[PDB]
Amino acid sequence: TKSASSFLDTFEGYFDQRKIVRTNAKSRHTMSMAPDVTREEFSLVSNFFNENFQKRPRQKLFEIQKKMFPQYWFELTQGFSLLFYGVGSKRNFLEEFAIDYLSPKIAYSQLNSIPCLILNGYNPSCNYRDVFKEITDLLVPAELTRSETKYWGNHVILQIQKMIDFYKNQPLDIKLILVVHNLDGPSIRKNTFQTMLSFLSVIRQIAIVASTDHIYAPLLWDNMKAQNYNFVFHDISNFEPSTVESTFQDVMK
Amino acid sequence: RIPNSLLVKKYCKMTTEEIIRLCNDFELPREVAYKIVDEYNINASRLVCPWQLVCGLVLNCTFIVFNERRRKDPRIDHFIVSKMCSLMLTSKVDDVIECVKLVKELIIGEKWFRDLQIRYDDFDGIRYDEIIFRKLGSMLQTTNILVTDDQYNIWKKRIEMDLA
Amino acid sequence: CLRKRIIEEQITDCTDDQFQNVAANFIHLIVQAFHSYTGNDIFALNDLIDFKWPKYVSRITKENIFEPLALYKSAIKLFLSTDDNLSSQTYDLSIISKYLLIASYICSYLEPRYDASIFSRKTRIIQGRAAYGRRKKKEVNPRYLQPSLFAIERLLAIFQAIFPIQGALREESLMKANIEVFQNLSELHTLKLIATTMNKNIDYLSPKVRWKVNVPWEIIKEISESVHFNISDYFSDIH
Amino acid sequence: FADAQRSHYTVYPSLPQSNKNDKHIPFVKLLSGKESEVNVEKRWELYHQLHSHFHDQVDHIIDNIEADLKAEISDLLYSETTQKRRCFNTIFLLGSDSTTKIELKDESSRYNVLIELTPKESPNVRMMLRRSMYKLYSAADAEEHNNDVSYDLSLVENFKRLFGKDLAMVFNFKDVDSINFNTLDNFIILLKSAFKYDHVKISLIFNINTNLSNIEKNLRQSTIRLLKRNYHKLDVSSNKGFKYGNQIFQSFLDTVDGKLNLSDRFVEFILSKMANNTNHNLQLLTKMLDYSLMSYFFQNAFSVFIDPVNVDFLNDDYLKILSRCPTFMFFVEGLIKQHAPADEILSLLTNKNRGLEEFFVEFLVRENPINGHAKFVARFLEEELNITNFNLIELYHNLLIGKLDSYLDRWSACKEYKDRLHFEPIDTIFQELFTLDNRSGLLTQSIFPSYKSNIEDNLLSWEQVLPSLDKENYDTLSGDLDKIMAPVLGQLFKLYREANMTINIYDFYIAFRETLPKEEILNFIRKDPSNTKLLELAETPDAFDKVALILFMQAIFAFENMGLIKFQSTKSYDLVEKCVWRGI
Amino acid sequence: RINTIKLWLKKDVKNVWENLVQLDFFTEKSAVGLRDNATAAFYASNYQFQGTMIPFDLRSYQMQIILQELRRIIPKSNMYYSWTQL
């Protein structure tokens, strides 16, 4: 009604809805005339509608896709990384998949459990040097010697390359499960973090279980990043209310 | 003069009697006819030709009301499109193939399409318990390299009469 | 290479003057042939003399050492063109990356208002009007300048307009942008063929980072020749 | 709580000590839960035998391309001189990704160092020089078995009197298309003055991932004429000269020789996806073939019958499954239509289990060599005919279709051999349980998905992801809401699709406000027994708008970090811009 | 108008173009030269300028010697001397 579009969404829907609208046909209405609320009325009706609008169909959907878990463990143990794109929060999926299901099954099969490094990549305070500090005490690799370090190089990338050539002479058992939430988040989409996380997925002895939120996500990875990940993509879009992450972002009036 | 086609004539006046005749040609039920003639009230002025939208409607809302009828034989799958190709005075079947594609995204998130696809459990041809395991990429999905379980026994029953 | 040519050709009518005169004549030939090319630089003449010397000794046969003119008429091929470059095909890229380079070349030289007159081709069902196009052809030739800056949705829209047909009613043959299109687009950004506003360590996933091509026309014509895409009639309404 | 507010919290999951079962393999019970556990164990061990036999050949090919490449480069790196003797050797490695190790020979009384250089290791000329002379002094003073020098070309000047050996440094620029050429020709100019020192031998090795008309367009012409003194080119790419696609696809047939078959659609999908990617194809070959194998042994129970010892575990459900193959239907229709024996088709139709149970085990001695004859066509084209520009995958595709003669006449070089290179094969009954295939779109959905299209489809239609229910409505909190009301963030997208390019957020809110039920949600909002705050706002005479703005603003600030909405006009954030269109 | 002048192709006018920036007849668009102190010549040695990452024949150069000053210094017995007027 408020769009005079002849076509709808294709390339000609792009070319058709990008017209030029005059100054009187426009509707300059500020959102001040929207009926203002408090922060606590939002905070109340939000957490009401999260778990009381489509709660049983969403639990039905999670039980539908919860019998998919042995295929995820099979794909992880055969070398691939996993990537869970979709509408809604994939957070509790990976918290109920990697903690509950996956590492008990990995720990039994090679006979404490298998360490799970969760990584809240929707938090913009996500440096890769303290994350790699957290990797280098769950594996504790060797140090960078004088000949193998270079003239003012990056020590993290050289250490991961040293771990890569170390773990070609090793048994193939999962030693860590690295659970990245919102892999294209605002401090992890940058290039050296992705070089780190792409060189970590070269190692067979670590299972990467990632998740994305943005829609132009796959152009973060070229023929070198998408080859060292070797993702397998799984649309597990489950329409979650996504209220763990929205406390980080601005909910400004 | 002979007619070339019927989905050519621009701004031909179409009343609801022709639309309900075209709906009762395909034996489509009441609650889909009372959406096909009620949508014509909505977009009537902005119509370059009203023998394309009503033409594509009665194959888009025909494939969703008779979905289980098509799964046993592919003869009805050609029967409805050939009936529409000869009812629209058209020699080329491709021009009514393009009709449902041009009208299909015009009604994709419509209301009556939304609660009419669940009524027959169509969900673009393949039902819900077969498509929710196809969106997740499950290796335990039903690929059609065999024949369907209710179809093998009816393949068996057409053999006992060819020997007795 | 000359002192083996004098015995390969059985040349006995020679002395040291008969070598140094053809040497000085060759140097004068490179000078009067290539001085308008180089300039007054000894270094750009030294290497031309080093290049074109044995291909000039390979043209003396039995009596070109006595005359100065039919030897120059026996080697006129190496005194017209310089032949200094490092030399078939154009680029060893994929098909969708070549069409992505072509579409990024199109959208960063075309004004964004005039594309619904060049690419919009499908039959309407609703009352709408297409783009009329530009009235007057501007003869400033925009593809001499620096390119423009576009959003990635315009590249993906022009990409599926110019793409050839692929793939009987459930195909929907108009190719959508899968993983491989985005992966090849990021590969083109890595190979510095499409490029952007280089802020230091820019995020690709922002609605404020716009893209541009930085390959010239002379390789885009060879690319559009390789995939056989008529691109000469895309900039026909400018010159 | 407050653990999802700090980045990288590691978590050790505690575990129950034992459950004492065989659940150490992911292979579920197939045949709708009728399979035996020993067959699942044999299926897992059989898949691992096949996967190990494949990857032990893939690793030898992948570690043989390096022994071919180190043999290739180190022959035109040496064994040649130039009469000018004041030039550096130059090797342009075309199409190569920077992934190769270079070996330098003995050549005693002369050091040979390799100085790898990177676009991160080169922000200007002085860091290139300091890193290069640092690597030179390190790889000179550590290959000797004591003062500190400055890292510039003076070490190259007095390398003869510092150590006693002649220098031969071989530079190696890793991503030559990614360095500044303005820094690179400055470095080449700065290296050119090393010619006057009579004990050096500079060699340059360029790893180019594009064509050579894009390197000699960006360089300066004097550097190009310096590089035209002793230059060689070398095409290093695994698509040139199809030898490593004719050794990965050849070795995949050596694992499936007789047990499995490949479909037509599968090999043409391989050819379509290997041609839309040029840089790495020896990896996109293996990660399609392995994922084809993994979706087979996870799905096909009859994989346990690809070994000729498990022939006796034909239960009743296997006989149900194999009977409804359409090739067997074509065979039984053949047994009807040519002649009429009654009591054999009456046996093998539905009654006799022993005839069908023993009939299938005859169908495994058959071979019908597709991949047993294709190696003969490969050896004929390589050895007797000497044509090394053929593709085994595409030749195998045409041999599988049957139009192989067109592909053999594509060269017009073997006209006297179109009978010798001919083979017309047929189908063997029960192929269609033993074929690697893609007719469900599985290798498409989970290796190369239409990502943005799937996101938009789940945003728009949403009934293919959320169920509809018919019993669980009264014990719930929202039973009548799943049928009359679309989910917010999936309802707002229906208005986002048919909006303009500039969407006023107040009009985008009003269009969302009048697509909600009014007389249902004002009854629904008073349902909670515990809290008391949610009911008093329903006692306010403007409840519907104050509950509508919460859901609208939640959906808007949920779309925004997904990528569909750009807030233009900062310090206003009132007029959003649609920036993702469906179908593209 | 007419024995002539050989038109050199754009594969050989590149060397001429580079020889007229190594004689300072063209500058770039806003490129400052040598910096004043030693740190500002270091702070810019780590910067990667946009005028050197774009292709060669699109760098927006700038004249050192205008056409009026070119008119009076070229001798009037030249075959391009009429072309210095505008």
Residue numbers in the entry:
A (entry chain B): 233 to 343, 356 to 497
B (entry chain F): 267 to 430
C (entry chain E): 214 to 300, 319 to 398, 407 to 478
D (entry chain C): 15 to 159, 178 to 616
E (entry chain D): 425 to 426, 446 to 529
What's written in the study?
The six AAA+−containing subunits (Orc1-5 and Cdc6) of ORC–Cdc6–DNA are arranged in a two-tiered, spiral structure that encircles the origin DNA, with the top tier formed by the AAA+ domains and the lower tier by the WHD domains. On the top tier, the gap between the Orc1 AAA+ and the Orc2 AAA+-like domain vacated by the Orc2 WHD became occupied by the Cdc6 AAA+ domain, and the AAA+ domains of Orc1-5 and Cdc6 form a nearly flat ring that encircles the ACS region of the origin DNA. Specifically, the Orc2 WHD was evicted from the center of the 5-membered AAA+ ring in the structure of ORC–DNA and was replaced by the Cdc6 AAA+ domain, forming the closed ring of six AAA+ domains around the ACS element in the ORC–Cdc6–DNA structure. Indeed, four ATPγS molecules and their associated Mg2+ were identified in the AAA+ domains of Orc1, Orc4, Orc5, and Cdc6. Therefore, the ORC–Cdc6 complex bound and stabilized 50 bp of the ARS1 origin DNA, which is 9 bp longer than that of ORC alone, which stabilized 41 bp of the ARS305 origin. Cdc6 was found to interact extensively with dsDNA in a bipartite manner, with the ISM of its AAA+ domain binding to the middle of the ACS sequence and the WHD hairpin motif binding to the intervening region between the A and B1 elements. The positively charged residues K477, K479, K481, and K483 in the Cdc6 WHD hairpin motif interact with the ACS phosphate backbone, but do not insert into the DNA groove, and therefore most likely increases the affinity of the ORC–Cdc6 complex for DNA. Our structure shows that Cdc6 binding stabilizes the Orc6 TFIIB-B domain, which in turn binds and stabilizes the eight nucleotides following the B1 element. We found that Cdc6 binding shifted a helix-turn-helix (HTH) motif in Orc1 by about 5 Å to form a part of the ATP binding site of Cdc6. In fact, the Orc1 Arg-616 points to the γ-phosphate and serves as the arginine finger in trans for the ATP molecule in the Cdc6 pocket.
